[PDB]
Nucleic acid binder design. Structure first.
Lengths: 144, 184, 134, 57
RNA sequence: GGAUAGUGGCCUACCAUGGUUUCAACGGGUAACGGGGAAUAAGGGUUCGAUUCCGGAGAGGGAGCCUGAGAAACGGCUACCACAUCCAAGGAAGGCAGCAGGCGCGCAAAUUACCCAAUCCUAAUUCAGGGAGGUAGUGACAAUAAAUAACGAUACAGGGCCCAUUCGGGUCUUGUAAUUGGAAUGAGUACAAUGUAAAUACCUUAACGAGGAACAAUUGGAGGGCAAGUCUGGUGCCAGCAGCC
């Protein structure tokens, strides 16, 4: 009889059985445990601002050989220290040190974007100015 | 607070964006009818979806059901009025077979093109937007009008437009000054 | 005054306010729109009820010109429109000249200040004056 | 170590090739008409590939 | 029995261990006010619902109360806790989770504007008040067609046709043409009428704007998924790209 009960009065068993077995789903488990709220460095938000502490030279994961440009960032709202990628070419020279940056995830929902080990976040703004603006020379960072 | 103003969308984006067969047809459709966007096709197909959904639900009901006897007749009268489906039917047939080409064939952009006052779908669209058209007594500039089959004989040029007397147009008025300035 | 062809529609006899209630629609080809000093006296002569007992408003121009529709109303007398016509329309038509008044911010602030004062206030000025020396 | 250098390299060695002046393309239904008369009214070569941006060979 | 407006362990004077519980009690959590609803759909579903309506609760945290038909009211009072203002220091004054606004917080959110003209409420039901409400200001998240050019001539490349030197022309146009001309209208500049008593924002004018930066359209992408370059220079496991390969 296919396993599961079929009787017209077995709705409770089907309900409880489904409830128990939804815990084997990764997304349901993560949502109802509140892991993003309690463990993720953004606290469950899309973005976070922080202060650059140091320039990074994260090596590429095999088989690619490259030095990804990243920054240690201590988030303002938490104090948690994260690593954010500075995406485009030469944009490290815009995010040098001690500035206030806006960070976003990599699109992997908390995993590695590519051959970059351990990096979950990327830079999108520097001192209130979009990193794409500085890379395309449309705007310039405040000199004073 | 004041009661909220309701609003609703009119178009729907296709599920798969880069479809060669669908992309070619839609841009082929825009050329033959002079439309500016794919959204101008998306809305017609969205409008058609609400119509096929309406007739499909109605046709699941049995014959001589008061719901489809009233709602089916109302949908027929509205669609016949706008001229999308043929008027020589009384069988609730064409509705589910209505194609996208039927709806934008009834638009004023093409309606004034084939009525001889426009000479092109692009010329009509510019003509439509520049207000050289009156449907009844009233000037319109809507490329998507859905003429109600009582206005195809009512179309005419706007009285407040060139070729209507006492109104040559701004560029003509400048040449009127040039006519006197040329001698002087 | 040429082919203005002003006319009224839906004329209903409203004697509780003692007036005639209707909508007024004008056809003004080759014309922007007709004004108050034109429409009001034109509505007066067509009705022969009074001169300043006429009121018009609304008057949206049809999309693309040509004609305009709005609302109108005619009283039995000018002395009867004085008792019913709204004040802002009377001031607009010239039947009353409103004296300048303090702004809402300033009016409310003055009410806040004199609510802080109990009594008429004549004696308060004397005590402050008598105590101002030291 | 030594990563505090060599960043932004190829963007700094790329020769500056300025944009060429061209007229503006039609925009809107006019641009839509441009694609329509680029794709369907020219039947010079629609045999096997219908190339869209073919380079010199 | 007391209390209550009233029922009632609501509270006060006794037995019986009475009541609940795997049909999940009782604990714990809730990045939980509930619902009408929202998003998403073949059918079933999954997720959301602080928030325009309804109900509940609260007025910085607790507690207590006066008046009053109705409040355990906070733009009423009393007290403690935290915070906090003005003092010639003896005292006095509180409370924007109303509106506008300010600071902080953060990824995240507007004007210290005009009015009762409308909607409706309040009073001594008959000229008042109303940041309730409306109006305007900011506002390219959300939505609705909406302009960013349209028509004609003028040198050949040939989805094709009359005749046979099949390159001896064509009412017939698909377009390279930075070759023109007879075009058309909008963005919009208020002491002019139409709405708020002070004004604004589609129309029409003693009056105006269009021939290239003109008065251009951007955002993304061109290996595959997923339509679109084995085109050209530069870098050369570097720089960088790459949601996945």
């Amino acid at each position: 009889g296919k396993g599961k009960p079929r009787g017209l009065n077995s709705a409770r068993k089907l309900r409880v059985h489904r409830r128990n077995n939804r815990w084997a789903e990764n997304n349901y488990k993560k949502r109802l445990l509140g892991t993003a709220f309690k463990s993720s460095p953004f606290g469950g938000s899309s973005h976070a601002k922080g202060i650059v502490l140091e320039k990074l030279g994260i090596e590429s994961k095999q088989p690619n050989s490259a030095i990804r440009k990243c920054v240690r960032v201590q988030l303002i709202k938490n104090g948690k220290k994260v690593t954010a990628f500075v995406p485009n070419d030469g944009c490290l020279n815009f995010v040098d040190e001690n500035d206030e940056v806006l960070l976003a995830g990599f699109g992997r929902k908390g995993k590695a974007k590519g051959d970059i080990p351990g990096v979950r976040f990327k830079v999108v703004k520097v001192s209130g100015v979009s990193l794409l603006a500085l890379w395309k020379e449309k705007k310039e960072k405040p000199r004073s | 607070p004041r009661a909220p103003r309701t609003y609703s969308k009119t178009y729907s984006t296709p599920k798969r964006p880069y479809e060669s067969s669908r992309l070619d047809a839609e841009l082929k459709l825009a050329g033959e009818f002079g439309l500016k966007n794919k959204k101008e096709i998306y809305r017609i197909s969205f409008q058609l979806s609400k119509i096929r959904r309406a007739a499909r639900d109605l046709l699941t009901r049995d014959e001589k059901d008061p719901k489809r006897l009233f709602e089916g007749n109302a949908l027929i009268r509205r669609l016949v009025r706008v001229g999308v489906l043929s008027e020589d039917k009384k069988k609730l047939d064409y509705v589910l077979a209505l194609k996208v080409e039927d709806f934008l064939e009834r638009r004023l952009q093409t309606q004034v093109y084939k009525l001889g006052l426009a000479k092109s779908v692009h010329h009509a669209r510019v003509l439509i937007t520049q207000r050289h058209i009156a449907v009844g007594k009233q000037i319109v500039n809507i490329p998507s009008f859905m003429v109600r089959l009582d206005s195809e004989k009512h179309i005419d040029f706007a009285p407040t437009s060139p070729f209507g007397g006492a109104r040559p147009g701004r560029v003509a008025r400048r040449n009127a000054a040039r006519k006197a300035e040329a001698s002087g | 005054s040429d082919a203005v062809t002003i006319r009224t529609r839906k004329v209903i006899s409203n004697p509780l306010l003692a007036r005639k209630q209707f909508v007024v629609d004008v056809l003004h080809p080759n014309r922007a729109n007709v004004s108050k000093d034109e429409l009001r006296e034109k509505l007066a002569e067509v009705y022969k009820a009074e001169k300043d007992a006429v009121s018009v408003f609304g008057f949206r121009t049809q999309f693309g010109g040509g004609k305009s529709v709005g609302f109108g109303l005619v009283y039995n007398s000018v002395a009867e429109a004085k008792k019913f016509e709204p004040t802002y329309r009377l001031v607009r038509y010239g039947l009353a000249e409103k004296v300048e008044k303090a702004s809402r911010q300033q009016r409310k602030q003055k009410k806040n200040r004199d609510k802080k004062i109990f009594g008429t206030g004549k004696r308060l000025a004397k005590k402050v004056a008598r105590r101002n020396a030291d | 170590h030594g990563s505090l250098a060599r960043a932004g390299k190829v963007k700094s060695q790329t020769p500056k090739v300025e944009k060429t002046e061209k007229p503006k393309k039609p925009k809107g239904r006019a641009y839509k008409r441009l694609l329509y008369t680029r794709r369907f009214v020219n039947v010079t070569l629609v045999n096997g590939k219908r190339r869209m941006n073919p380079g010199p060979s």
